[PDB]
Design a binder for this molecule. Structure first.
Ligand SMILES: CCCCCCCC/C=C/CCCCCCCCOC(=O)[C@H](O)CO
Ligand SMILES: CCCCCCCC/C=C\CCCCCCCCOC(=O)[C@H](O)CO
Ligand SMILES: CCCCCCCC/C=C\CCCCCCCCOC(=O)[C@H](O)CO
Ligand SMILES: CCCCCCCC/C=C\CCCCCCCCOC(=O)[C@H](O)CO
Ligand SMILES: CCCCCCCC/C=C\CCCCCCCCOC(=O)[C@H](O)CO
Ligand SMILES: CCCCCCCC/C=C\CCCCCCCCOC(=O)[C@H](O)CO
Ligand SMILES: *C/C=C(C)/C=C/C=C(C)/C=C/C1=C(C)CCCC1(C)C
Ligand SMILES: CCCCCCCCO[C@@H]1O[C@H](CO)[C@@H](O)[C@H](O)[C@H]1O
Ligand SMILES: CCCCCCCCO[C@@H]1O[C@H](CO)[C@@H](O)[C@H](O)[C@H]1O
Ligand SMILES: CCCCCCCCO[C@@H]1O[C@H](CO)[C@@H](O)[C@H](O)[C@H]1O
Ligand SMILES: CCCCCCCCO[C@@H]1O[C@H](CO)[C@@H](O)[C@H](O)[C@H]1O
Ligand SMILES: CCCCCCCCO[C@@H]1O[C@H](CO)[C@@H](O)[C@H](O)[C@H]1O
Ligand SMILES: CCCCCCCCO[C@@H]1O[C@H](CO)[C@@H](O)[C@H](O)[C@H]1O
Ligand SMILES: CCCCCCCCO[C@@H]1O[C@H](CO)[C@H](O)[C@@H](O)[C@H]1O
Ligand SMILES: CCCCCCCCO[C@@H]1O[C@H](CO)[C@H](O)[C@@H](O)[C@H]1O
Ligand SMILES: [Cl-]
Length: 212
């Protein structure tokens, strides 16, 4: 009743609507949000059209998903870094930590043997370091800003930390890991998370930009 392609089209539409909404409201932050959801829109369309479905051993890996993540997640971290007022050196640490997470996940998905769990573990370790920087140094830094900016940062940070922490569990329980969850359920869960961590993220920012 509900196929993989239908789910991909749903993600595509959701990202498209977010993209147009952000572009209009911007008639730096607004341009970043267009990139976050705009890139994801393209990845989902490609996947909806059946492009980039790589067979690996016994499972199917969706390559556009990881290219999406590698480009859009640093933009989310960048957005949060601007809110917190990071110096260009602090940016380098967190964006480097982020890229290690994304690359490790991409590589582990593409490896058929058990070495893929070794790649997954390395992404997990780097993710814990990324969480430390969001909850600590970047929160210290955001404190120096107005009360409204600091409030916005804390809200987006909380959304980001809680939801991003769920992805490694979905990956591990799905086809890439112990292939418990079926591809359809696993995809459905990730489409939901992608939409909330990108389009939901964006709309919470828009809401605060009008409350000024
Ligand atoms: C715009 C954000 C600016 C911040 C970004 C910071 C650094 C981003 C890191 C980029 C390196 C990503 C390499 C892409 C992998 C391409 C393999 C593609 O190969 C393939 O096609 C698959 O193997 C197919 O199965
Ligand atoms: C300065 C005041 C600004 C006030 C706000 C005005 C916003 C008007 C401009 C853009 C609206 C963006 C929402 C996208 C609607 C497209 C739905 C199109 O319907 C669909 O989604 C199709 O069925 C499938 O894509
Ligand atoms: C250390 C600090 C250095 C500062 C680094 C800044 C990095 C980020 C800078 C600008 C954000 C890039 C936005 C990309 C928009 C293009 C996607 C367009 O997406 C699309 O494909 C179409 O929209 C599809 O409809
Ligand atoms: C001031 C802003 C500066 C921004 C700097 C961002 C640069 C970060 C770039 C690359 C980080 C590479 C980490 C390599 C681990 C990837 C594991 C996956 O790789 C592998 O496992 C093997 O290579 C595959 O054979
Ligand atoms: C039967 C084959 C699969 C069963 C067990 C492999 C270890 C699973 C560890 C899950 C947590 C990743 C973290 O664990 C790891 O990264 C391990 O060091 C992989 O070697
Ligand atoms: C703060 C005040 C308003 C921003 C929160 C509303 C976000 C609505 C769009 C969620 C984005 O849409 C979604 O994630 C759907 O639930 C997916 O089915
Ligand atoms: C818009 C897309 C988003 C916000 C995607 C987020 C994805 C993650 C936080 C994934 C994290 C992973 C780990 C922590 C370990 C390795 C496997 C990953 C890539 C699923
Ligand atoms: C390429 C032609 C295939 C179109 O396919 C359709 O495209 C729509 C996207 O706007 C989706 O809403 C539909 O679910 C999908 O079946
Ligand atoms: C500052 C004006 C609003 C933000 C401009 C975003 C610049 C990136 O390009 C954007 O691509 C989108 C489609 O791919 C369009 O919807 C935007 O209008 C376009 O500006
Ligand atoms: C004058 C109104 C400008 C609208 C916002 C700036 C548009 C930025 O344009 C974007 O810049 C990127 C390079 O960083 C390119 O890769 C993108 O393709 C391009 O759309
Ligand atoms: C804004 C327009 C961006 C267009 C990006 C489309 C990327 C999908 O391009 C795809 O790349 C594959 C490479 O093997 C080919 O097999 C597919 O035929 C092709 O559709
Ligand atoms: C060669 C490996 C498969 C990738 C190429 C086949 C693409 C099949 O998909 C087609 O791609 C087109 C891209 O514009 C779409 O317009 C069509 O609606 C779609 O049916
Ligand atoms: C069959 C033996 C494994 C097949 C190839 C495993 C793929 C690991 O190579 C991966 O390719 C891409 C290159 O940047 C990225 O995903 C990763 O950086 C890299 O680890
Ligand atoms: C901009 C983000 C979307 C980029 C996704 C492009 C992924 C292309 O991926 C390709 O798809 C084809 C399968 O149909 C090829 O045959 C595969 O080998 C694969 O490399
Ligand atoms: C946002 C949409 C929610 C849909 C939740 C997923 C429920 C459908 O999950 C089912 O899984 C089976 C395999 O596991 C079938 O093969 C699928 O056809 C699908 O019907
Ligand atoms: Cl996958």
């Amino acid at each position: 009743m509900v196929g993989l392609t239908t789910l991909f089209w749903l993600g595509a539409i959701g990202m498209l609507v977010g993209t147009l909404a952000f572009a209009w409201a911007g008639r730096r932050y607004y341009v970043t949000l267009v990139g976050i959801s705009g890139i994801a829109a393209v990845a989902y369309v490609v996947m909806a059209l059946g492009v980039g479905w790589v067979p690996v051993a016994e499972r199917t890996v969706f390559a556009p998903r990881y290219i999406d993540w590698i480009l859009t997640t640093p933009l989310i971290v960048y957005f949060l870094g601007l809110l917190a007022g990071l110096d260009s050196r602090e940016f380098g640490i967190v964006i480097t930590l982020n890229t290690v997470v994304m690359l490790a996940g991409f590589a582990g998905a593409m490896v058929p043997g058990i070495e893929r769990y070794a790649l997954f573990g390395m992404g997990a370790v780097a993710f814990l370091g990324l969480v430390y920087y969001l909850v600590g140094p970047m929160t210290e830094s955001a404190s120096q800003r107005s009360s409204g900016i600091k409030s916005l940062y804390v809200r987006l940070r909380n959304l980001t930390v809680i939801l991003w922490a769920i992805y490694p569990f979905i990956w591990l329980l799905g086809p890439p890991g112990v292939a418990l969850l079926t591809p359809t359920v696993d995809v459905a869960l990730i489409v939901y998370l992608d939409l909330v961590t990108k389009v939901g993220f964006g709309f919470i920012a828009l809401d605060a930009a009008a409350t000024l």
